[PDB]
Design a protein around this ligand. Structure first.
Ligand SMILES: CC[C@H]1CCC[C@H](O)[C@@H](C)C(=O)C2=C[C@@H]3[C@@H](C=C[C@@H]4C[C@@H](O)C[C@@H]34)[C@@H]2CC(=O)O1
Ligand SMILES: OC[C@H]1O[C@@H](O)[C@H](O)[C@@H](O)[C@@H]1O
Ligand SMILES: [Mg+2]
Lengths: 373, 369
């Protein structure tokens, strides 16, 4: 009987990536508690989970970690996360002392989970949400800043985790990421209602455009407007537009070949679509991949450029890699056409789907965790 | 598998099925809840996806009596009339989504009709104590065999499997044998309270009545439970009720805690008694956590659950209006439990019955086969 304390980064999307494992834990009779800043409360509660309370784009240099610009972005991200970890450390120590977890399930970027495991001598299981480009600059800066802290408390430095779980198709994972144990991606894109039109395809070429809140909060409307314009202008297309409610206002004068999806989890209808246009957020992208649906990716930040490049190398989609490509309406339209006219992209996407389904499901991982706790 | 889930339109019946629905999804199967408006917020609050669909009375515990037989017959009549009314809506759903298996609440007869009409296997799911043998079942056949026979069946079909989370010690003696599944608490989402971690030097007594019960009974079982609990020396009452029932708590002692929208399981291990109406997520969470109960049954299965719990030595029943309205019987029952560690001993015995059962993840294999 484990008591698993879950330590995500405080973005809704990173928690979602861990929800099927949390359900697998609870379905197998273990107890799960999510350490959640205000920003995560609603996401955790919405997955049926319980919480303990805590409290310029696109930018290709994120995918250029061999350059000084890219090293800086990742070093700054580690410095931000490390400072947060020192800030919140007392609250997380009080929580662990109160709840007495036997294992920490920790998002790969949530460095506080690693500090907490060292200081409390608890097994840490890191969880990737997807492509992990934290080797090199992020990881070196996290050690730079957190090894002294861990040494003051008697340890050699920031500890190496007991295990890293990895749902990324191996043929897409970053070459420098440490080996992780496979865990099969299970779509979880929130709750909601099966729409009537989600049951069958029509004669039109159905293209979903899905961009999430954190991406659009960062980027502003541009990638959404560029996608809606490219998709709706192409002969034959029906666009299904899936964006968060407050962003729906950005879509004035919408084309008659456009439906605005009403907070509907992608996996309820994505089997009826021939193409997904997205930013390379894992929930969207791995659901499409699992379902053998090719993607046109407009990467923006963090790991998105690596996902987009590697998906395109796999033949399973097209990448528009920077702002001159994403803002090239002709190239954008021709890329949608290219995918709708060549079944080889869907076929390459099913090859990746097979990499996913070769992995053990979250339910099968519960055993591994039992052995590590 | 593609599992379409057909609960009765009550939040608590769907909650009893949530951990299995999660176990199904964690093991790579697909799950959809057929949800009327009354179920939508519960389903989506468990992270699940939906297809939208458009007291006390001790006779419920006495199916040998004229009244007891008539209550359970009338309940089957109600459900059978509603299943016929809605049958064309569910048939359109099954055509749109194409399930391979129906996971159906024991009482949601539409699921059995639908399984028969579509030649799909039906896995019934008990939520706890199951008193549907006799009156309910006989009446369901009397009313639903005809539509089934019109479709060429022999009658309302026997289901493929009946999942049962009730510890056998507490189950009704006439419930056909089911396949045991470990009760996993699911009381909704919420926040771990500061004080839920540590025991106190006070005697911590949780009262948890619940929206559905209190909407049916009005305030009396809640306020009679608070009056009994707060009278006894050294007691700390922890009162768990829906947001809307918070305003009924007009005068509490200083040390009492109102736990609004806090799932019981986050703190119950620090309590020595739960006072409740029975059956339910509350009672099985108490029993799973080894906590004795004082049960004031109101309707349906609650009388059986209260009697069997008392028989097993893990609680006390206040069986009817005469007992529940008697503050001396009510206070003396609390004091009895607080004064005898044999109740907690018996409760722990049942907890172990529960935890010896296969968990919902282990049952996923059985459903596949
Ligand atoms: C499915 C639609 C409804 C139609 C309404 C009928 C009655 O109002 C309701 C009190 C009832 O009989 C029922 C309430 C439920 C139903 C059966 C068993 C439940 C055990 C308890 O937790 C509550 C019980 C029953 C029939 C019903 O729901 O019929
Ligand atoms: O099985 C013994 C008793 O169990 C109860 O559930 C029934 O309502 C009674 O009629 C019966 O005598
Ligand atoms: Mg590799």
């Amino acid at each position: 009987h484990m008591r698993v304390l879950v330590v995500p980064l405080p973005y809704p999307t990173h928690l979602m990536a861990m929800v099927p494992l949390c359900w697998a834990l609870q379905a197998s009779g273990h107890e799960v508690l999510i350490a959640a800043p205000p920003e995560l409360q609603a996401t955790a509660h919405g997955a049926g989970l319980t919480t303990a309370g805590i409290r310029r784009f696109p930018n290709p240099a994120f995918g250029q970690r061999d350059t000084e610009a890219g090293r800086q972005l990742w070093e700054q991200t580690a410095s931000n996360v490390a400072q947060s970890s020192l800030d919140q450390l007392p609250e997380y120590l009080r929580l662990a002392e109160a709840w007495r977890p036997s294992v920490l399930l920790v998002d790969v970027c949530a460095l506080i989970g690693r500090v907490l495991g060292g200081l409390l001598d608890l097994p840490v299981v890191l969880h990737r949400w997807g492509v992990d480009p934290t080797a090199g600059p992020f990881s070196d800066r996290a050690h730079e800043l957190l090894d002294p802290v861990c040494r003051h408390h008697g340890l050699t430095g920031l500890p190496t985790p007991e295990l890293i779980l990895d749902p990324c198709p191996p043929s897409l994972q970053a070459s420098d990421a440490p080996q992780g144990a496979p865990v099969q991606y299970v779509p979880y894109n929130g709750s909601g209602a099966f729409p009537a039109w989600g049951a069958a395809r029509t004669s039109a070429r159905r293209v979903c455009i899905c961009m999430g809140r954190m991406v659009l909060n960062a980027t502003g409307p541009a990638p959404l407007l560029r996608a809606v314009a490219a998709a709706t202008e192409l002969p034959g297309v029906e666009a299904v537009i899936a964006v968060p409610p407050e962003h729906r206002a950005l879509l004035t004068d919408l084309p008659d070949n456009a439906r605005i999806a009403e907070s509907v989890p992608l996996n309820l209808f994505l089997r009826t679509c021939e193409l997904v246009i997205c930013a390379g957020g894992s929930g969207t992208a791995f659901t499409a991949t699992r379902l053998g649906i090719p993607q046109l990716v407009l990467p923006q930040y963090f790991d998105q450029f690596d996902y987009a490049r590697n998906l395109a190398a796999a033949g399973a989609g097209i990448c528009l890699p920077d702002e001159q490509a994403q803002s090239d309406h002709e190239q954008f339209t021709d890329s949608i056409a290219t995918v709708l006219g060549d079944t080889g992209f869907a076929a390459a996407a099913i090859k990746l789907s097979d990499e996913i389904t070769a992995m053990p499901h979250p339910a099968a991982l519960v055993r591994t965790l039992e052995n590590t706790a």
